Every structure is written in structure tokens, then in C-alpha cells.
Design a protein around this ligand. Structure first.
Ligand SMILES: N#Cc1c(O)c2ccccc2[nH]c1=O
Lengths: 300, 237
């Protein structure tokens, strides 16, 4: 069980760690988060009390290094930083653990929510969507735009999700215009799965990462990407059986975890109605359809 | 974006454009079977592709064999339309290719956009105008060549005959849409107005009668009266 310790907490802030969150007061003696489960990526995220503009945060994996959070009063945010001296880190942390100045990652033993939301998410893939190679962790915020959004303006600060566009030469084989537009199987299976992602695990990982950025940061381009990746599967008549079953589990946990009050902005009515009621796969997402109907029957 | 009453003069500027109407592509007669069920029989159709500035009509005849063994024909018809319009554009020299294509029915937007991916600089636009191009099959020479076709065929016409020698494109298009609106609202009465006089003939190389300027005023007035009448005969006014 690993630890993301904090220099201090000079400004009042709501801190998230994965699906959990707690409020820290200005200059409250807070020195970080312990008992973080090894084996998963994690995200530590922030919303300042004085300016709810810009939720921001850091994706990290404690197996890749020793990380700490420190407030920068010049740039005005909590920054993740890696400690290269392992003794100094163990020593600063143990002192912080002995003074009980750390909150405990509050995982219920029965609870597989975080695993289910991050099953296919790998740090190495995050670091290719979010390019900042000198760090082992990845900064995301509410305002960052995606490669695709920019094509339609600072490239170093972009989310490099795989571009999906149903009316593009990439999606439509010359001579198969109607076929490929109405059945997206060749775009899913040949172009995307075999060609770009290499396997369904990487595809699901990007879909899951896009959802988590939409949920935790209100990142609009991430929500667009999440819906596009769902729609591409549902709009394909030919999808491996293992992918449909896994997709149903993935979406079920995403819908389960979504704040009830954010459904108006994080869920696209058209995509969901098409996917659950009109698409080729309208009958292949039983768990997702059941939770959506019982939790958001208005949207539908 | 969409073409409407506010940007109507754009139709007659010097940027090449084409209207595409797919109404008459997939045509059927509905009938009873021996067992008393209902079935359709397709008849030949056409794509109506018209340059409103010059009057040049690219009438692509859709022969019933294109539907043989196909499903969901009304959906296929939109895609076949877009395939043929794209084929037409590719067949034209670059300097004759349109800058815009305006579809009369919004359901043609996605099929045409997808077939025109190779032409990203050709704008595909809908229109809010309710144009009467479905009535093209009320023009006797057009109906005749469509019904007589035994194979797919493209036939070229000028839908304005020689009118542009005497009037502007704007006025020619206004006359065409009045004639077609009349034919759509009351075909029998419209044809009587046009063709009741056998002394006023249609040139071999024309579609409409050779009316003098003053006879066109009389004709145009008779067509308006017909449309207004039908509007009353309809709603009772
Ligand atoms: N300044 C400073 C530092 C810290 O506050 C710190 C706190 C937690 C972990 C490692 C740390 N390293 C530092 O360099």
C-alpha cells in the first residue's frame, strides 16, 4: 500500500482520489493520502474552494516512482512532483504517518468499483494520450482540448485521443460508402482494432480513460471521445462476443458511478438512445440498459 | 448552410451549383396479389440534377434492374442517388465541377456527403425552399425517356429551352418553378393550359411550348390562378 504525501495545504481545496473526495481547509495540517492500492492507476484531483473553475489532477501509478503533492504559489496550483531520493521520501512519509497527518484511501473490501472503472487503463497508454515525457505522471484539467477538437489550439497541452470520425475517408472504403456508413464493422475491426489499437484491451483502456476524464474534470472533449468509442462498437454489426460482454460490464460501472446530478451534461441523449434501442447491439447490453432505464429514464 | 428565401440570388451568381432532387428515383405502383396481400412493382425512375443558372439538366434514368434483389429500397435509393451524383461530378472537367450541391430533401445530406469525401471543397447544402421538382415527370418528354429506358442512361436537357436568350436566369427559374408547382398541384389543368392549343407547338429540341413573351405573361397568369384556385378548392376559401 503506497502513499502520495503532501508538502502542505496552503489553500482550501476539495481533493479527490479516484472516486473519493474530502475537503481540506486553508492551512489545515494535511500531509497526504496513504494506503493507496497497488496494482491500479490512480488519479488525485483538485477543485479550489475560491475558484471552482478548473478541476485539475494527476494520473499516476505508485509502482513507477515516489510522488508527492506541493502547492506552487506562483502558478497557483497543487503540483505533483517525483522524489528521486528514496530515503528522504521514506523518512518524510514515516514522520507524516507517525503524526497521523494523512487520510487513508477508504476502500471497502467488497468494493471492486475502481478496478471495474480502470480494468484496461495502463499508465503507459495515458502517457501517450497526455504527452509530457519528463514526468511519470500525467496532468489533466477541465479545459484541455483534444487533437480532434483542435483540428476543427496549443498542441503541447492537448489530449491525443485516437481520432474517430464517421464521415471520413478513414471510416469509409471507396466503393463501400453505404455499407461502411451504415455498418461500421470494418472501421471498428480492421482500421481501429487491428490497425491502431492492436487489441480490444487498448481500445477499452482509452474508452475508460476518456470517461474518467469526463467525469472527474468535466472535460468536454473526453466526453465526446467516450461517446464516439461506444457508438463505433454499437454501430457495428460484427463485434467479437467477448467485446460486447465486456463493454456491457464497462458501461454498467460507468453509469453506476456517474453522479446522478451530472447526467444532463455527461450523457448524450442521441448516442444512448441509438445504442440501446436502434443499433445492431441494442440487445447485447442487458446490464447497461437495465441500469440506464432505472437510473436515467428521463434521458430515454 | 441552408438555402432559403434570404439567400435566393445566390442561385444565379457565377459559382457553379447543382440542385439534386431524388423524389423520382424509386417509383412504385402498389397493388393486390392473388392471395389478397399487397405488393409493389417498381417502375423506372430518375435523378433530377439541375444547374439553375444555365438550365442544364443531367437526367440520370434509374432503371428498375438496379433494384433487383436489393432490400430497403427507399434507403438504397438515397445512396444510389449519391453514387450517381458523385459519378457525374467525377465525369465533369474540373472547371465544370460544382462548388456547391443543394439537395432538395435533407435525407440526402449524409449519403451525398459520404460519397463526396474525395471533394472536400464541394459544399453539400440543404434548402428550406419547397421546390416542385417532383413534378419533373409531368413534363411529357422527360417522362417519355424515363419510361422507355431499357438500361441505365444519362440524358441531357436544357430545362429553360431558349428562354435565356430573352430573360435572366432568375426569371427563368421563377417561370420553371411556377410551371412545376402548377403541374404538381393540378396536373390535368396545368397541361390543358400549356397544350390545349395545338397551334402553339413544342420544338423538337425543346420541352415547353414556343410562347411569345406576351403569351408567357398570359400563361404565367393562368398558372398562378390555377395554384390559387387549388389552394381554395383545397382549404375551401
Ligand atoms: N520542498 C520540498 C519537498 C517536500 O516538501 C517534500 C514533501 C513530501 C515528499 C517529498 C518532498 N520533497 C521535497 O523536495
Amino acid at each position: 500500500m503506497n502513499t502520495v504525501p503532501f508538502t502542505s495545504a496552503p489553500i482550501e481545496v476539495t481533493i479527490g482520489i479516484d472516486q473519493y473526495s474530502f475537503n481540506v481547509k486553508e492551512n489545515q495540517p494535511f500531509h497526504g493520502i496513504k494506503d493507496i492500492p497497488i496494482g491500479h492507476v490512480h488519479v488525485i484531483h483538485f477543485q479550489h474552494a475560491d475558484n471552482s473553475s478548473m478541476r485539475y489532477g494527476y494520473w499516476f501509478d505508485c509502482r513507477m516512482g515516489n510522488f508527492y503533492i506541493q502547492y506552487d504559489p506562483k502558478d497557483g496550483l497543487y503540483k505533483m512532483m517525483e522524489e528521486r531520493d528514496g530515503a528522504k521520501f521514506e523518512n518524510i512519509v514515516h514522520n507524516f504517518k507517525e503524526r497521523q497527518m494523512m487520510v487513508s484511501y477508504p476502500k471497502i473490501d467488497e468494493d471492486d468499483t475502481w478496478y471495474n472503472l480502470t480494468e484496461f487503463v495502463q499508465m503507459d497508454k495515458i502517457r501517450k494520450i497526455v504527452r509530457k515525457d519528463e514526468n511519470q505522471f500525467s496532468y489533466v484539467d477541465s479545459s484541455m482540448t483534444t487533437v480532434q477538437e483542435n483540428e476543427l489550439s496549443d498542441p503541447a497541452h492537448s489530449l491525443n485521443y485516437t481520432v474517430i470520425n464517421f464521415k471520413s475517408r478513414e471510416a469509409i472504403r471507396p466503393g463501400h460508402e453505404m455499407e461502411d456508413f451504415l455498418d461500421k464493422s470494418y472501421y471498428l475491426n480492421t482500421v481501429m482494432l487491428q490497425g491502431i489499437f492492436k487489441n480490444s484491451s487498448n481500445y477499452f483502456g482509452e474508452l475508460q480513460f476518456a470517461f474518467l476524464n469526463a467525469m472527474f474534470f468535466g472535460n468536454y472533449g473526453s466526453s465526446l471521445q467516450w461517446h464516439a468509442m461506444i457508438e463505433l462498437i454499437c454501430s457495428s454489426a460484427t463485434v467479437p462476443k467477448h467485446m460486447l460482454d465486456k463493454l456491457d460490464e464497462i458501461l454498467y460501472y460507468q453509469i453506476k458511478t456517474l453522479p446522478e446530478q451530472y447526467s444532463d451534461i455527461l450523457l448524450n441523449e442521441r448516442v444512448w438512445n441509438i445504442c440501446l434501442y436502434s443499433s445492431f447491439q441494442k440487445n447485447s447490453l442487458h446490464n447497461t440498459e437495465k441500469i440506464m432505464e432505472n437510473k436515467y429514464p428521463e434521458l430515454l | 448552410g441552408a438555402m432559403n428565401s434570404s439567400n435566393y440570388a445566390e442561385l444565379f451568381n457565377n459559382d457553379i451549383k447543382l440542385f439534386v432532387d431524388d423524389t423520382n428515383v424509386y417509383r412504385v405502383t402498389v397493388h393486390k396479389t392473388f392471395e389478397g396481400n399487397v405488393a409493389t412493382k417498381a417502375i423506372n425512375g430518375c435523378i433530377f440534377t439541375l444547374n439553375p443558372k444555365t438550365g442544364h439538366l443531367f437526367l440520370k434514368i434509374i432503371h428498375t434492374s438496379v433494384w433487383a434483389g436489393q432490400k430497403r429500397l427507399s434507403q438504397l435509393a438515397k445512396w444510389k442517388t449519391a453514387e450517381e451524383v458523385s459519378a457525374l461530378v467525377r465525369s465533369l472537367p474540373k472547371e465544370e465541377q460544382p462548388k456547391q450541391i443543394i439537395v432538395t430533401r435533407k435525407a440526402m445530406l449524409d449519403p451525398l456527403e459520404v460519397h463526396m469525401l474525395d471533394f472536400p471543397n464541394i459544399a453539400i447544402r440543404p434548402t428550406e425552399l419547397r421546390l416542385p421538382f417532383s413534378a419533373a415527370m409531368s413534363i411529357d418528354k422527360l417522362s417519355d425517356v424515363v419510361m422507355k429506358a431499357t438500361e441505365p442512361q444519362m440524358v441531357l436537357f436544357n430545362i429553360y429551352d431558349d428562354w435565356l436568350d430573352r430573360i435572366s436566369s432568375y426569371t427563368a427559374f421563377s417561370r420553371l418553378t411556377l410551371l412545376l408547382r402548377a403541374l404538381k398541384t393540378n396536373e390535368e389543368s396545368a397541361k390543358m393550359i400549356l397544350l390545349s392549343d395545338p397551334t402553339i407547338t413544342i420544338k423538337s429540341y425543346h420541352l415547353w411550348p414556343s410562347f411569345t413573351d406576351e403569351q408567357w405573361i398570359t400563361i404565367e397568369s393562368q398558372m398562378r390562378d390555377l395554384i390559387l384556385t387549388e389552394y381554395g378548392r383545397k382549404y375551401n376559401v
